[PDB]
Amino acid sequence: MVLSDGEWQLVLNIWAKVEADVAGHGQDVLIRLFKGHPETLEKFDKFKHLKTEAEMKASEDLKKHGNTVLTALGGILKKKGHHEAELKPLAQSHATKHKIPIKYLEFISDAIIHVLHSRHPGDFGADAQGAMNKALELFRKDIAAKYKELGFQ
Ligand code: HEM
């Protein structure tokens, strides 16, 4: 389920803009995730104390984790169609340690798309949106395959 060269270029072109403020994007993504799907917040022992959007926005640890998430995703995206090594430890920890259903990965994928549109209305047009959908679909597909191996799928 392979992206074209042009599709990868669109993905990484918008991603280079994310990289001007990775932590801010990452915090926005986690806030969108937690507000839209509160069950996801409950998987984070270290964030479940946050009861309001303002509290989420004020948390420096949440911002840091947002940076961690998007920096790791950036690493995956820059490997384009060959991200096996980067994806492996992530699937492993999310399956066995953090116990994160694939469905929650769908939720965060949608949150990323939402945030990219919110912050970049002009640059993140339909072509880039579609290419980013495909890149995040491939991410989910490959994680789900590792989950299946490990009996978490
Ligand atoms: C784009 C998708 C995601 C990426 C790239 C990502 C990345 C990471 C990374 C790099 C870490 C630290 C290293 C590790 O433990 O593997 C981490 C930790 C963690 N992730 Fe994710 N993650 C993603 C999605 C999610 C989702 C959707 C959830 C929950 C709904 C989640 C829950 C957790 C938890 C609970 C930890 C440990 C947090 C702590 O330090 O207390 N992850 N994630």
Residue numbers in the entry: 0 to 152
Excerpt from the paper describing this PDB structure:
Hemoglobin (Hb) and myoglobin (Mb) are the key molecules in animal aerobic exercise, as they are responsible for molecular oxygen (O2) transport in the bloodstream and its storage in the skeletal muscle, respectively. In the present study, we investigated the molecular evolution of whale Mb by experimentally resurrecting ancient proteins. The analyses of their chemical properties and structures demonstrated how Mb molecules evolved to adapt ancient whales to deep-sea environments. The atomic structures of the synthesized aMbWp, aMbWb’, aMbWb, and swMb were determined by X-ray crystallography to 2.4, 1.6, 1.4, and 0.8 Å resolutions, respectively.
The aMbWb and aMbWb’ proteins are the common ancestors of the toothed (Odontoceti) and baleen (Mysticeti) whales, which would be closely related to the early whale Basilosaurus27. The seven residue replacements; namely, E27D, V13I, T34K, D53A, Q116H, K118R and N140K, were deduced to have occurred during the evolution from aMbWp (terrestrial ancestor) to aMbWb (aquatic ancestor). Two residues, G1V and G15A, are different between aMbWb (polyphyly ancestor) and aMbWb’ (monophyly ancestor). Although the side chains of G1V and G15A from aMbWb’ to aMbWb did not appear to be interacting with other residues, their introduction might increase the rigidity of the main chain conformation. Furthermore, the ten residue replacements, D4E, N12H, I13V, V28I, G35S, K45R, N66V, G74A, D109E and F151Y, occurred during the evolution from aMbWb to extant swMb. Unexpectedly, log S0 decreased during the evolution from aMbWp to aMbWb, and remained almost unchanged from aMbWb to swMb, indicating that the total solubility in pure water has not increased during evolution. The folding free energy changes from the intermediate state to the native state (ΔG1) and the total free energy changes from the unfolded to the native (ΔGfold) slightly decreased from aMbWp to aMbWb, whereas they significantly decreased from aMbWb to swMb. The analyses also revealed that the adaptation via the ZMb-increase strategy reached a plateau at the last common ancestor of whales (aMbWb’ or aMbWb).
